[PDB]
């Protein structure tokens, strides 16, 4: 399992969030934040399977990039669990 | 160590909240966050020694249990280390 966090400009939300859905990526969070690089963001934190690891920075790369200084960057973490509280799911089942 | 994150429905931060004084945990930290599964949701953090894992998801899942769709997810990462910034105190010493 991964956690996949992405920051970016506030604007790109939409861009982001629709390439997401995409793949079949429905289930996320978003943060409003603020970068030093002070102003204004959105943090949007998705935790995925493994297996979807290369298809899910690529679909977002390519839904924020402009080639302009600011396009965001991503930040990639190991997840041990993820437990669905309603049923108890774990891990792939819990998403 | 672990890190363990609960996202939830912002009305049960109070039975979590209760619920993790049980066993003793009044540390923790709170983010009014947005969850598109977009609505208001609360995202509780909280570091742990690793004999404490299975009795924190346990609580916290009876905490926010109801059977109902959006009772929450429960996602645990490693922690490499914690520091109190006061004592210089590490890991299981600075919670
Ligand atoms: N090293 C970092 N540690 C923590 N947060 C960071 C770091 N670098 C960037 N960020 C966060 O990511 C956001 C997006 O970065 P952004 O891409 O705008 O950076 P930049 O340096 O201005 O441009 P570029 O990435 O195109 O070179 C920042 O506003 C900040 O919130
Ligand atoms: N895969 C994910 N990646 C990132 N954040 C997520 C993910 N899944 C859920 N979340 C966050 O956890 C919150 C709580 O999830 P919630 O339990 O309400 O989901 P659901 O799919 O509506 O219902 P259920 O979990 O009961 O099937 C979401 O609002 C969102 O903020």
Same mark, same amino acid.
């Given at each position: 399992?991964? /956690?996949?966090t992405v920051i970016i400009?506030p604007? &790109?939300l939409?861009?982001?969030?629709?390439?997401?859905?995409? =793949? %079949?990526?429905?289930?996320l969070t978003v943060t409003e934040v603020k970068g030093?690089?002070? /102003?204004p963001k959105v943090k949007i934190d998705?935790?995925?399977? !493994? !297996?979807? /690891? !290369?298809?899910?920075?690529? =679909?977002?790369?390519?839904?924020?990039?402009? $080639?302009?200084? %600011? +396009? %965001? &960057?991503?930040?990639?973490?190991?997840?041990?669990?993820?437990?669905?509280?309603?049923? $108890?799911? #774990? +891990?792939? #089942?819990? /998403?």
């Amino acid at each position: 399992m991964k /956690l996949v966090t992405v920051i970016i400009k506030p604007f &790109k939300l939409e861009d982001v969030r629709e390439a997401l859905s995409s =793949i %079949g990526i429905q289930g996320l969070t978003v943060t409003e934040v603020k970068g030093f690089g002070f /102003l204004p963001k959105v943090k949007i934190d998705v935790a995925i399977a !493994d !297996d979807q /690891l !290369d298809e899910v920075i690529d =679909i977002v790369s390519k839904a924020a990039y402009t $080639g302009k200084i %600011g +396009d %965001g &960057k991503i930040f990639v973490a190991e997840l041990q669990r993820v437990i669905r509280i309603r049923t $108890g799911e #774990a +891990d792939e #089942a819990a /998403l």
